[PDB]
Every structure is written in structure tokens, then in C-alpha cells.
């Protein structure tokens, strides 16, 4: 289980040479599933000695409906106020 390619490819002991020395190629060890990124932006800047990995995470994805409803009350009241103001004037 790997998240970063530089950790994935650093020291891999499940290479075809060794697995052929044992000759047991299990399905769960497919390289299609071994590494997968975090789906959050991660770019590289130049630190003091080497590359520095900076993650750009802007908004959460686990918001529930109650947060949306509570954050919408001022907008709904503004809409009501503006419509009634238009009706009166």
C-alpha cells in the first residue's frame, strides 16, 4: 500500500526477479492497485535543500445538508426582504 510514487519505487522487493525466484504471482499484488494518489493537490516548491511537497486543499467534501441550510438562512431572508421591498415600492 503506497501513496507516493517516490516511496513506491524507492526500494521495491516484489520485483519480477524475486517473484520469479519464488514463481508465485498472486492476483492481489497487481501493480494496477499498488499505488494511488490522494486526490488532493500536491505540487513541489524548492525548499532549503531539496524539493518540498506542498498540498493545496481548499474545501472539504463531507459537508452535510444541515450546514448548507444554516448557511443559506441569511440569503433566503434577504430574498424575502428584497421581494417585499419591491412589492411595497
Amino acid at each position: 500500500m503506497f501513496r507516493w510514487l517516490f516511496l513506491y519505487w524507492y526500494n521495491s522487493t516484489d520485483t519480477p526477479s524475486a517473484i520469479a525466484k519464488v514463481n508465485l504471482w498472486s492476483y492481489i499484488n497487481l501493480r494496477l492497485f499498488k499505488a494511488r494518489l490522494s486526490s488532493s493537490i500536491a505540487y513541489y516548491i524548492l525548499g532549503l535543500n531539496n524539493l518540498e511537497l506542498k498540498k493545496l486543499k481548499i474545501f472539504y467534501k463531507n459537508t452535510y445538508f444541515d450546514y448548507i441550510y444554516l448557511k443559506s438562512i441569511p440569503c433566503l431572508f434577504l430574498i424575502i426582504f428584497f421581494t417585499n421591498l419591491y412589492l411595497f415600492l
Binding site: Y43, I45, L48, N49, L51, F59, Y67, P74
Partner: protein, 384 residues
Amino acid sequence: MISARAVHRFLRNPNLETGAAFRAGTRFDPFKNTLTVLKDPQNGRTLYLIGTTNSSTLLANRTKDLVQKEKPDAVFVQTNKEWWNLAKNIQDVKCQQELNRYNDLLSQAYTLSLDNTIRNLVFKAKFYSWLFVINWFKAFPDDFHPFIPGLEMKFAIEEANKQNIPVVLGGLEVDDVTLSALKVEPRLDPFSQLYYGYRALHNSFWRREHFDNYATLDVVGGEAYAESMDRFRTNWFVKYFEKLAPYQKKIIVDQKDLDLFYALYRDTPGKKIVAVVNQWHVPGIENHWKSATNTHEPLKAINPIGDMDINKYMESQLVNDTLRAFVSKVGKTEPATWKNYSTIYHKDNYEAERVRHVAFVDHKDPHMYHGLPQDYDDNIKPKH
């Protein structure tokens, strides 16, 4: 003269890169977020400042035991005579839920001795509207009422009466003194308060913080939330109040902190004081007490570049310059980038803007060959 120490700081560990099981700190820490010990070596006085949210039975029992065993020379409880009468007439209650059952009766102690004149009636209307709006923005449940005193105050007063030591009542959060102070400030308005309270969280950070704070209050009850309110959470709440209503925050927090410090420092018997005050007055009272008694923790000077490793940067530059010179001499060529490690901010990989570093002003400039392999000897020696 002025000791400008930090008082209300809620940002914890901004130098850590926390997250994913590496937290910025522990917020539970009960029995320590609440009790603070302060000393006055000039007069040999000891103060036990207990900041209560009036919601936890465990803290009420701890305060009762502290008053029982410490035997102070004075107890300073932040209540008033009306609340004390109502609470002393209530008996056979030993848990905070039962006392929360009487929350309306104890809230009857909020009595305003105002006139019936036109100006006072207008002020009462404005103040009640502002209170309604600020309670909408505060949004606390029944079981968490930091401004309605509960079992901790009652136990402190009863244990003070058992030992026959004087009890000094400092008044509730909104008492006659603070009511007159709010009368002086004409900045009370429900509509402006609504508009400013829906603009307080001006960036994502505050919003997020807001969420999680109240999120915990919705998951854990008032009793479990009173224990997990540390100094950083208290400072965040006072700053949130400041963002909601800076003038009323100045009147209710800062000025009342100064008044409580005055009462605890001068208007008290002394030589041992147990002061059960509200949670968010503890930072200000403690800061004022330490500044007046000079009992501040020793200063550890913070150099802005103290945590900057300039040697790392300079060694990297030197190493990469030597490597560029060595590789250029081996290959009989010149460096291509002059950037130690390739990152996409300059877009020099696919555009025409090089990162070449060759600067000189004339043909006689000694620094003409700096950055070029001609600057090094055949032994890759930095000079000549």
C-alpha cells in the same frame, strides 16, 4: 511600564504542519483548563482562580472539594444576591442536570433596575432586541449555559458558609454596572447586529473553526463540553464575540476583566482567595494579576530567523555550484539551468526565460566568471 504579553491567543502551533493523527494539542485536559494558581509575593497572597462554564457536575465537585480542603480566607463568587437566594432555597440537588431543570427560575435573577421613562423604555427595547440577536448568534443549548450560574457557584458559596469565611458576590455577566456601561454606548441595534454577525467569519479559517467548535457542542453534551474547553478555545470564543460585537465585547469582557481584577486585588480580605468566576474572564484576570505582581513566566526571546537554517540553504547553493562546475568540466560544456532543482514556477522548462546567473558590469569585472565553469580550477577549486 506596560507589559504587552499575549492575552487572548487561540492559534495553537502555527509552526508544526499538523494533521492526520499529529494534532496541534490536547483540548480535553480537565481539572487544569479550569483552575489557575496565582501568587502575590509582595503581600504573600495566594489566589485560586476557577473559571466555570456552570455546566459540569465533575468540575462542581472538584471546586467543592478544593474549597473544603484549601480553607481560603475569602471566596469570591461571580453571582448576585437574587441568584444566591434562589439557589439557597433550592436543596437536595447534587447533579447539574437537576439544576438545569431550574434554568428559568435561576435566569429570573437577571433583574434590571431601570426606570420607566421614555428613554429607558427605548433602551430596554433596543437591549432586548440585541440580546435576542446575540443569543441567536451564540446558539447555545439548554445544557450548556456559561452565563447562568449553576452547581459550582452554589457549592462554593455553601462551603464558604460552612467555614464561616466571607463571600464576595461580583454580580452576573450583565449586572447594573455593565448595564449602565451598555447604556453609555449607543451602538446597540438588532439589525446592524444581524448584519455584522453574518459578516464576522470573513475567511474560511474562522468559518471552519466555528463549525467544529459548535459541532463538538452538538455531539458531546454541555457537561462533556465544559471539560474540554481550554484556554485556546476560550480565547477563540472571546475573539468570536469581538468579531460579532467589538463594542459590547469591550464592555463585557475587557472592562469586566479589569473590574474583577480590581476586586480580587484590592477589595478582598486576602492572604488566601478562591475566586469562582466565569470561564472567559480568567485570561484577563490572570494577565492583570501577573503584570501587577510581576509574576510572569520568564521571557524566551524569539528570533524571527531562529528556526531558519541558513546553513542548509548556503550549503545547498555551494554544493550545487560545485556540482555544476564539476559536470561542466567533465562534459566540456556549461550548465543549462543554474537552478538547483527544477520546479514549475518560472515555466523555464518550456518557455524562453532562462535562469542563467551571469552578472558583470564591464570587461574588468572580477565577478564576470562567477557561475561559469571557468571560475574553477581543474581540481574543482572554488577560486580561479
